[PDB]
Amino acid sequence: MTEYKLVVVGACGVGKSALTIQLIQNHFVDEYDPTIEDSYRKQVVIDGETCLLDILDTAGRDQYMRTGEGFLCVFAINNTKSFEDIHQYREQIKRVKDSDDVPMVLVGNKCDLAARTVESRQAQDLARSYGIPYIETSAKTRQGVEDAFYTLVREIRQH
Ligand SMILES: Nc1nc2c(ncn2[C@@H]2O[C@H](COP(=O)(O)OP(=O)(O)O)[C@@H](O)[C@H]2O)c(=O)[nH]1
Ligand SMILES: [Ca+2]
Ligand SMILES: [Ca+2]
Ligand SMILES: [Mg+2]
Ligand code: NA
Ligand code: NA
Numbered sequence: 001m002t003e004y005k006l007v008v009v010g011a012c013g014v015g016k017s018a019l020t021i022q023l024i025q026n027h028f029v030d031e032y033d034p035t036i037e038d039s040y041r042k043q044v045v046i047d048g049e050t051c052l053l054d055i056l057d058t059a060g061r062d063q064y065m066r067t068g069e070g071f072l073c074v075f076a077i078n079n080t081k082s083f084e085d086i087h088q089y090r091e092q093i094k095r096v097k098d099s100d101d102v103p104m105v106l107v108g109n110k111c112d113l114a115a116r117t118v119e120s121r122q123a124q125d126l127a128r129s130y131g132i133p134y135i136e137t138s139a140k141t142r143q144g145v146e147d148a149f150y151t152l153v154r155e156i157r158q159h
Contacts, residue, residue: 001043002051004153007064009089010074011082015109018139019074020057023149028140035059046153053149065096070103070156072148075118076110077136083108083118083126090130103155104132107148112138 008016017032024040037059043052056064073089075082086106094100106127108118120136127134133151137144 002049004051004053004156005064005067005069006053006055006072006149006152007058007068007070008055008072008074009058009093010072010107011076011079011085012060014074014076014079014082015137015139016059016072016074017057019072019107019109019137019145019148020055022139022142022145023053023055026142028142037061039064044150046150051153053153055149065093069159070105070152072105072107072152074107074109075123076113077108077118077120077123078110078113078115080117083123086126101131101159103152103159104130105148105152105155106130106132106134108134108136109139111136111143112140 008020010016012034018029021029024042039056041054071093073086075086093102108123123134135144135148137148
């Protein structure tokens with residue numbers, strides 16, 4: 001059975017854990033320990049293929065960075081600093097992968113919140129500059145969550 005090794009990165013508080021737990025448990029967590037870093041497993045069918053997702057939810061390991069097959073680079077659309085921080089996460093990934101061609105999806109999380117300070121078009125443009133997709137999500141409503149993870153799988157498959 002095929003396994004896809006995924007790594008979720010981004011600034012503290014953007015919703016890395018909430019996204020991961022929403023995908024695994026179908027539940028929105030309101031106060032998950034910001035320091036807990038662990039890997040989670042889920043069997044899913046994607047485009048007719050039964051596969052295993054092996055997901056590291058990082059909390060700011062070396063093994064997953066080195067052997068991770070794709071990365072969700074997450075910021076929150078109500079957190080300008082987190083968006084600005086994305087560049088540094090992608091630079092770290094390029095250094096470990098020794099490549100500028102790494103399966104990756106840019107995720108703008110917390111799209112349910114009204115205090116938007118990063119416009120969709122800003123993030124689209126960032127993603128275009130990296131040659132990667134941009135997807136908006138809400139870990140709270142579940143909007144876009146499966147799409148983000150499954151798109152990452154589809155990006156790994158093109159690699
Ligand atoms: N409204 C809203 N809050 C969110 C969302 N995702 C995460 N949060 C909240 O943001 C805070 C940080 O989430 P968390 O998963 O711990 O972030 P992490 O540090 O990236 O793992 C928590 O209070 C979450 O409940 C979302 O999509 N919408
Ligand atoms: Ca290197
Ligand atoms: Ca390397
Ligand atoms: Mg966390
Ligand atoms: Na602005
Ligand atoms: Na690309």
